């Protein structure tokens with residue numbers, strides 16, 4: 495594993511790779527499953543049911559996970575996915591690339607909102 | 618314009634079920650027309666949403682720790698839109714297992730890849746959804762006869778793995794149908810052929826068995842009932858409609874906390890059948906759910 499993980503860390507850098515793919519004009523990953531919902535939800539990032547607010551779109555989590563879509567191991571402990579079996583809320587302005595949004599952004603462990611897109615704990 | 622346009626779809630009226638028609642070629646006046654879907658919504662998300670909106674009007678049993686299995690959950694997209702809608706609809710904690718011949722990424726608790734005939738489980742289920750369709754069904758070279766393939770597996774799965782009180786929604790089309798499956802519909806408290814309003818231009822329907830009784834309550838001839846279904850579709854044009862997709866306020870399946878009991882076949886009396894028929898009882902053990910996919914070992 496030592497020499498296998500050492501190599502994966504160097505080359506398998508999906509987050510950076512996808513960011514470079516978009517920079518090179520790569521077409522964003524499609525077929526993210528957008529759900530029908532009231533759009534009157536809590537607005538938290540990852541939820542057990544669609545929670546999109548008036549400024550968000552809710553998607554099936556697994557379809558917005560780069561690791562699930564590319565069939566590559568997850569970096570999280572024990573290859574645990576944070577999106578599979580859940581619903582991810584994406585700002586309507588970024589709904590054209592849910593995979594890119596989930597990669598470039600992180601969730602606030604206190605309010606459950608996206609940092610920079612709903613989290614107001616710094617007030 | 619039509620009042621049924623604000624409904625999630627249309628169920629086969631009772632008088633059409635009581636006819637004795639001969640099988641005719643299906644000829645829909647709007648055949649192939651596409652529905653106008655809300656922006657960025659996939660056809661299968663709209664289709665499953667309307668199916669679930671219709672299932673919300675039936676006497677479905679909804680126990681704690683409900684067990685749902687979804688066949689034909691994959692797609693050419695490599696994702697599972699239908700599974701995403703079922704998980705949104707079903708109460709939180711519902712065990713959802715899905716399956717498909719082809720690999721796909723899913724929101725289900727467990728996913729089994731391979732022919733449905735390779736899927737095994739000693740456990741009983743509360744709800745079976747099938748969206749399976751054999752691509753070769755498009756090759757219409759002979760008389761439209763009853764199809765086997767995955768339908769033989771679905772009939773056996775219902776007879777051996779569906780809990781009494783459980784329900785099913787099995788996708789059929791003009792050419793993708795099975796006589797034994799229609800006959801099995803007579804083993805439920807109620808049944809219908811449901812057409813989603815977003816796919817009104819297709820011969821597709823979901824055959825719904827509501828509350829499994831484990832014995833025939835009515836005798837149904839499958840060959841006659843499919844002919845009756847096509848006669849209904851041929852003489853009742855349905856207007857494409859996505860109207861029901863815009864109001865999701867009451868979408869989630871009501872958590873009824875339906876009682877789950879273990880009863881011997883000799884203890885299934887008329888009082889028990891009455892409870893099953895109202896969605897107030899599920900008969901099965903509540904053991905851990907174990908599933909397996911047969912793997913063929915070759916050189």
Ligand SMILES: C[n+]1cn([C@@H]2O[C@H](COP(=O)(O)OP(=O)(O)OP(=O)(O)OC[C@H]3O[C@@H](n4cnc5c(N)ncnc54)[C@H](O)[C@@H]3O)[C@@H](O)[C@H]2O)c2nc(N)[nH]c(=O)c21
Pocket residue numbers: 643644645646648750751752754755757790791792793818819820821
């Ligand atoms: C009902 N119908 C059938 N056909 C003819 O008979 C053939 C077989 O008919 P069918 O049983 O496939 O029914 P239908 O055409 O209504 O099915 P449709 O294509 O709408 O597909 C329904 C669903 O089946 C599934 N499906 C269809 N094709 C595939 C596929 N290749 N792979 C996987 N799933 C598929 C999808 O979930 C899809 O939404 C058709 O391909 C067509 O030549 C008709 N022709 C006319 N002119 N008018 C009709 O009204 C008509």
Ligand SMILES: C[n+]1cn([C@@H]2O[C@H](COP(=O)(O)OP(=O)(O)OP(=O)(O)O)[C@@H](O)[C@H]2O)c2nc(N)[nH]c(=O)c21
Pocket residue numbers: 674675676677806807827828894895
């Ligand atoms: C929807 N449904 C229909 N039935 C049977 O069918 C009878 C009439 O129910 P119906 O829905 O067919 O007719 P109704 O005029 O009430 O409504 P509409 O057709 O939607 O305008 C019921 O009293 C039951 O005997 C049903 N029986 C059971 N057990 N479960 C169901 O979900 C169910």
Ligand SMILES: C[S@@+](CC[C@H](N)C(=O)[O-])C[C@H]1O[C@@H](n2cnc3c(N)ncnc32)[C@H](O)[C@@H]1O
Pocket residue numbers: 661688689690691692693697698699700716717718719731732733734748749750751752766767
């Ligand atoms: C219309 S597609 C399903 C679409 C899916 N329900 C969705 O939500 O988009 C029909 C599916 O049935 C599957 N299928 C057909 N025959 C099968 C079989 N014998 N066993 C398992 N899956 C089968 C196909 O692989 C295909 O993915």
Ligand SMILES: Nc1ncnc2[nH]cnc12
Pocket residue numbers: 620623
């Ligand atoms: N005009 C109408 N008729 C019947 N059902 C409806 N639901 C919403 N509007 C309706």
Ligand SMILES: Nc1ncnc2[nH]cnc12
Pocket residue numbers: 840
């Ligand atoms: N139309 C039909 N074709 C084949 N077998 C049948 N058994 C009963 N009706 C039938």
Ligand SMILES: [Cl-]
Pocket residue numbers: 540541542543
């Ligand atoms: Cl939540």
Ligand SMILES: [Cl-]
Pocket residue numbers: 566567568572573574
């Ligand atoms: Cl993993």
Ligand SMILES: [Cl-]
Pocket residue numbers: none
């Ligand atoms: Cl836009």
Ligand SMILES: [Cl-]
Pocket residue numbers: 630631632633
């Ligand atoms: Cl009628």
Ligand SMILES: [Cl-]
Pocket residue numbers: 652653654655
């Ligand atoms: Cl559209």
Ligand SMILES: [Cl-]
Pocket residue numbers: 656
């Ligand atoms: Cl647009």
Ligand SMILES: [Cl-]
Pocket residue numbers: 718719720
């Ligand atoms: Cl595959």
Ligand SMILES: [Cl-]
Pocket residue numbers: 728729730731910
């Ligand atoms: Cl598998």
Ligand SMILES: [Cl-]
Pocket residue numbers: 759
């Ligand atoms: Cl022949």
Ligand SMILES: [Cl-]
Pocket residue numbers: 763764765766
């Ligand atoms: Cl066959």
Ligand SMILES: [Cl-]
Pocket residue numbers: 765766767
């Ligand atoms: Cl076969």
